[PDB]
Amino acid sequence: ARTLGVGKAIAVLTSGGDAQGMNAAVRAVVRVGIFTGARVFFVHEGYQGLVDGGDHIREATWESVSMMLQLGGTVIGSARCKDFREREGRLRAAHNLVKRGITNLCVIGGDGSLTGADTFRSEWSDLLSDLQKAGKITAEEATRSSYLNIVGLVGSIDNDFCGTDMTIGTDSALHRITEIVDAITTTAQSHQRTFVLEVMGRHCGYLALVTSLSCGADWVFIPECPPDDNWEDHLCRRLSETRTRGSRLNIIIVAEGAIDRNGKPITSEGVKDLVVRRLGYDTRVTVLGHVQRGGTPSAFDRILGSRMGVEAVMALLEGTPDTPACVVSLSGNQAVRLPLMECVQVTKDVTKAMDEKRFDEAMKLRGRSFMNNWEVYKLLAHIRPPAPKSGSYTVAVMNVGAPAAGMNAAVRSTVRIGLIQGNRVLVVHDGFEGPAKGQIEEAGWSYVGGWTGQGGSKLGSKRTLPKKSFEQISANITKFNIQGLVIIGGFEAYTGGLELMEGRKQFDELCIPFVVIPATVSNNVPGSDFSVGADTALNTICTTCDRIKQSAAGTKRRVFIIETMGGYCGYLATMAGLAAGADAAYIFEEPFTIRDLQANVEHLVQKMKTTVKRGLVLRNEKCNENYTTDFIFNLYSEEGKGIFDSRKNVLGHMQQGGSPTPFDRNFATKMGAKAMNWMAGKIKESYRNGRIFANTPDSGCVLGMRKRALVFQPVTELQNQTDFEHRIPKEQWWLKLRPILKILAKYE
Ligand SMILES: Nc1ncnc2c1ncn2[C@@H]1O[C@H](COP(=O)(O)OP(=O)(O)O)[C@@H](O)[C@H]1O
Ligand SMILES: Nc1ncnc2c1ncn2[C@@H]1O[C@H](COP(=O)(O)OP(=O)(O)O)[C@@H](O)[C@H]1O
Ligand SMILES: Nc1ncnc2c1ncn2[C@@H]1O[C@H](COP(=O)(O)OP(=O)(O)O)[C@@H](O)[C@H]1O
Numbered sequence: 054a055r056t057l058g059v060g061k062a063i064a065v066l067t068s069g070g071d072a073q074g075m076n077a078a079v080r081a082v083v084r085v086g087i088f089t090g091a092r093v094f095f096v097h098e099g100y101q102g103l104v105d106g107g108d109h110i111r112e113a114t115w116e117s118v119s120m121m122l123q124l125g126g127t128v129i130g131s132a133r134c135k136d137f138r139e140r141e142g143r144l145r146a147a148h149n150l151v152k153r154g155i156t157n158l159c160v161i162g163g164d165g166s167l168t169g170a171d172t173f174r175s176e177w178s179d180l181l182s183d184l185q186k187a188g189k190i191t192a193e194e195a196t197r198s199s200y201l202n203i204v205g206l207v208g209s210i211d212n213d214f215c216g217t218d219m220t221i222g223t224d225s226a227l228h229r230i231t232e233i234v235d236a237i238t239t240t241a242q243s244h245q246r247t248f249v250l251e252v253m254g255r256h257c258g259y260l261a262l263v264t265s266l267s268c269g270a271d272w273v274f275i276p277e278c279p280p281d282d283n284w285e286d287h288l289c290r291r292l293s294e295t296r297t298r299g300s301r302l303n304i305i306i307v308a309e310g311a312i313d314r315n316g317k318p319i320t321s322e323g324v325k326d327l328v329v330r331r332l333g334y335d336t337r338v339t340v341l342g343h344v345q346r347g348g349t350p351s352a353f354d355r356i357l358g359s360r361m362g363v364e365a366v367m368a369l370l371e372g373t374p375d376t377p378a379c380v381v382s383l384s385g386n387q388a389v390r391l392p393l394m395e396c397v398q399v400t401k402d403v404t405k406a407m408d409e410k411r412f413d414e415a416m417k418l419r420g421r422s423f424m425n426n427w428e429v430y431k432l433l434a435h436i437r438p439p440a441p442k443s444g445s446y447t448v449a450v451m452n453v454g455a456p457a458a459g460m461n462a463a464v465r466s467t468v469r470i471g472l473i474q475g476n477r478v479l480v481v482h483d484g485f486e487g488p489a490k491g492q493i494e495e496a497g498w499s500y501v502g503g504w505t506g507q508g509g510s511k512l513g514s515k516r517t518l519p520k521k522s523f524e525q526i527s528a529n530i531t532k533f534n535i536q537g538l539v540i541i542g543g544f545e546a547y548t549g550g551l552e553l554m555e556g557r558k559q560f561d562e563l564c565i566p567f568v569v570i571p572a573t574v575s576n577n578v579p580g581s582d583f584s585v586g587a588d589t590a591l592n593t594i595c596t597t598c599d600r601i602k603q604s605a606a607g608t609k610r611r612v613f614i615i616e617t618m619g620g621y622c623g624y625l626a627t628m629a630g631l632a633a634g635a636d637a638a639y640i641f642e643e644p645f646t647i648r649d650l651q652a653n654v655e656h657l658v659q660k661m662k663t664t665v666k667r668g669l670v671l672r673n674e675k676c677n678e679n680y681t682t683d684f685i686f687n688l689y690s691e692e693g694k695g696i697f698d699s700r701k702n703v704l705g706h707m708q709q710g711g712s713p714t715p716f717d718r719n720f721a722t723k724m725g726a727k728a729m730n731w732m733a734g735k736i737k738e739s740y741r742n743g744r745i746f747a748n749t750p751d752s753g754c755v756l757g758m759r760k761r762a763l764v765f766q767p768v769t770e771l772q773n774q775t776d777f778e779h780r781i782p783k784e785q786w787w788l789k790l791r792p793i794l795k796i797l798a799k800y801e
Contacts (some may be wrong), residue, residue, distance in 0.1 A: 081362020566752025
């Protein structure tokens with residue numbers, strides 16, 4: 054309760070380099086801290102200000118952190134303080150903390166900033182014994198002894214720190230690198246242009262690799278897996294092969310830290326020389342640099358910051374004199390608290406691992422998804438397909454339902470990995486209306502050329518179901534020889550999937566296996582924590598929310614009521630509501646009585662009266678049939694008659710050809726591969742009599758992200774896990790957030 058951090062005060066601090074999201078993190082720490090009834094002190098300019106003092110440590114006020122969520126970089130400012138690397142420095146800062154009573158330290162930094170704080174709470178003890186030779190009164194110390202616990206949120210655009218699935222800013226970083234390539238690409242038309250982007254990457258190929266998977270990079274260079282002997286030619290033959298195969302351009306991403314087998318760095322510029330001294334085409338080089346670090350923070354990063362924030366402050370109060378250092382982290386999509394040292398003493402271990410030419414090892418400590426992205430990437434950018442024909446299983450891929458950003462990313466993968474396996478792959482136009490009307494065709498390796506970035510649905514999707522036309526489809530699945538189905542779509546994908554099983558009872562043809570890759574703006578599919586194209590939507594809501602809000606700022610003291618999409622699923626609403634820091638986001642999964650609405654409006658008002666000048670009120674397009682937008686609006690209006698102005702617009706259904714964000718492109722890529730892979734199997738094990746017959750419920754699935762790993766779940770199994778009238782899954786991880794969303798809004 055709010056009786057947790059009373060008689061307790063904490064110092065927050067950025068350190069290291071600006072990472073879009075640090076502000077949101079700070080804000081969280083400030084507010085949740087003040088909320089725990091504790092006191093929060095700012096401490097400007099990284100570890101410096103802590104070393105310095107007085108003027109560098111103002112006390113934080115609630116209002117102090119508004120207008121931050123969306124602001125790039127750090128407002129509490131960061132520095133590089135070399136002073137802190139030595140004891141004297143600490144003696145100095147530690148002095149400054151005990152002088153103000155602060156006993157809790159929040160450090161939002163990185164591999165370094167972290168290990169600094171790390172090796173501080175460490176030898177803090179004697180630091181006190183030392184401060185007693187004169188320093189301060191042993192009385193202001195007696196009761197401020199062994200309780201200086203510290204936690205550390207990892208900000209970092211290179212996302213290298215070991216232990217967390219995402220560091221703050223890297224999504225944003227990814228966005229930047231993408232926007233460029235996005236452009237660098239949509240207009241290179243004019244000669245076989247060959248770009249050479251050099252992205253951030255000390256001793257970490259993450260942004261490097263990922264940017265390559267989204268762009269459809271022709272070649273990459275990553276620290277952890279050096280090209281070893283040969284290659285120039287490899288890359289030439291490559292860039293050369295693709296030349297004849299037809300191509301407007303080439304993109305060769307290069308991690309900064311790009312080295313060769315021997316450690317003697319491969320230079321972006323050198324790559325350029327090569328590609329020209331050999332095949333010679335206008336080959337240019339760009340070196341993004343310190344921009345990747347700016348721009349405004351993405352929904353994810355705004356959100357990740359808020360989450361880590363609270364996790365930090367909590368870890369800070371629940372702290373103890375018998376507990377080790379905390380490093381809140383995202384993991385399996387749930388916040389964890391990992392031991393600081395363990396983390397650092399490891400994240401470090403990956404560099405050594407690399408120092409010694411032990412890259413297989415380096416690649417190991419990175420392990421996770423990394424290794425996959427790697428293998429999957431090489432595969433998809435791959436030279437080309439081997440010897441086809443023969444008794445190759447043939448699969449069909451289709452889209453079903455409302456369109457999404459990522460569908461093309463998914464289809465492209467599904468097909469390619471398909472051909473890499475040696476299987477035939479048909480492509481279906483217009484979801485189920487497809488096998489039915491029979492608009493099916495074979496997809497060659499190019500059919501999906503550079504789709505990865507294209508939004509909307511190249512293939513065509515319709516949310517119509519299949520039952521009413523099994524005759525037709527079964528007829529076609531028999532004529533085209535479809536013997537496996539990969540369905541990319543949303544609730545109708547799942548729903549039409551269940552509709553398939555039933556068919557297995559009446560039709561032999563239907564007795565093939567099928568996977569369902571979730572692609573829905575709304576994130577309403579049972580089976581996964583995230584569908585594809587959700588971020589892309591969620592990232593557009595956020596944007597225009599910020600616009601609407603931070604606009605017409607002339608009228609001053611005004612409130613906006615915004616209605617987001619998502620049917621009955623209040624994911625978008627809830628998430629955006631938290632990313633654009635709205636005072637309230639009325640969603641369906643959490644019913645509200647008018648006694649609430651009031652308590653809620655008799656609340657924004659008390660704010661529009663004092664501190665705040667702009668109000669944000671988000672409402673799910675279905676949170677409730679009577680308390681309509683128009684209801685909420687007028688209620689919010691009248692009630693704020695004197696005090697403020699207020700307008701209300703309905704975003705409605707947009708993102709027509711909305712280009713998928715780096716994350717959706719990746720998510721949609723990792724999957725369509727993971728499925729065409731899994732399907733290779735089921736078609737294998739479902740063959741028995743020179744016929745293929747799946748009639749188990751192991752075939753026919755929905756592939757979803759489940760707190761930590763993808764899992765093929767059987768449709769029939771999810772049924773009692775899903776509300777069908779509202780078309781929303783029954784368990785929704787994110788409802789767990791609402792509270793933290795109401796906290797940052799200063800409620801309860
Ligand atoms: N080993 C260390 N001991 C003490 N402070 C450190 C250490 N490493 C880094 N720092 C501090 O972290 C801040 C920035 O270091 P950097 O190496 O840039 O960390 P990061 O990679 O997390 O941004 C500076 O205040 C620096 O003094
Ligand atoms: N845009 C995002 N929206 C939601 N979660 C995200 C986003 N970006 C990263 N994450 C989180 O980071 C986790 C770990 O990512 P990871 O396994 O390394 O794959 P990638 O290499 O695609 O990040 C994702 O599974 C997800 O939980
Ligand atoms: N797109 C790419 N970017 C960077 N390296 C690549 C790419 N594609 C292939 N390679 C590298 O080519 C080398 C050989 O490719 P591989 O698939 O192992 O077949 P083979 O070893 O017979 O040439 C590997 O080191 C692989 O990492």
